[PDB]
Write a protein that binds this ligand. Structure first.
Ligand SMILES: C[C@@H]1CCC(=O)N1Nc1ncnc2[nH]c3cc(F)ccc3c12
Ligand SMILES: [Cl-]
Length: 167
């Protein structure tokens, strides 16, 4: 048993809710919140901008030190950093950005990072400003992640479409 509340169960291990991931993170304080990161960990907008804003820019400060030491992530890759006031840890995961021409096939690799964590609160990777079809992202999530994932979908119309179209 865990403290996630109000989720619809899609599969044995995937759950979904219409929620703002920032407010969900602040309420639950999960062990792991997933950020929709880019390779430079520049948290300017979308989920990343919102998570970073909620940390009063501490996520960005930590991220800039990470990049200065390690260089950029790979598309499809991840790193574990602090969750600040939102979670114990933040798993920064880079899904492909279709608006940059990045290979949508890398979305499966991106979701494989979730399997290193028993339970996660997460957005749909490559959705929103990353330009992929969220219905496809949900399908890849369900077919790739084997650990317990609680998906937060900000947009109510999209949430309803994801549920109603789920196979
Ligand atoms: C990209 C995915 C696909 C469907 C969807 O809604 N996405 N985004 C979110 N998902 C969950 N919480 C969020 N909080 C946010 C706060 C923001 F400023 C901006 C975006 C989000 C957001
Ligand atoms: Cl977005």
């Amino acid at each position: 048993v865990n403290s996630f509340s109000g989720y619809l169960k899609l599969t044995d291990n995937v759950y979904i809710k219409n929620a703002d991931i920032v407010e969900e993170a602040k309420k639950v304080k999960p062990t792991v919140v997933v950020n929709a990161a880019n390779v430079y960990l520049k948290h300017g907008g979308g989920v990343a901008g919102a998570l970073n804003k909620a940390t009063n820019n501490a996520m960005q400060v930590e991220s800039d030190d990470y990049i200065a030491t390690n260089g950029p992530l790979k598309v499809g890759g991840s790193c574990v950093l602090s969750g600040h006031n939102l979670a114990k840890h933040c798993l920064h995961v880079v899904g492909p950005n279709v608006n940059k021409g990045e290979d949508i096939q890398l979305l499966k690799s991106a979701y494989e990072n979730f399997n290193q964590h028993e339970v996660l609160l997460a957005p749909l990777l490559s959705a929103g400003i990353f330009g992929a079809d969220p219905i496809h992202s949900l399908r890849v999530c369900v077919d790739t992640v084997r650990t317990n994932v609680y998906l937060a979908v900000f947009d109510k119309n999209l949430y309803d479409k994801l549920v109603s179209s789920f196979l």
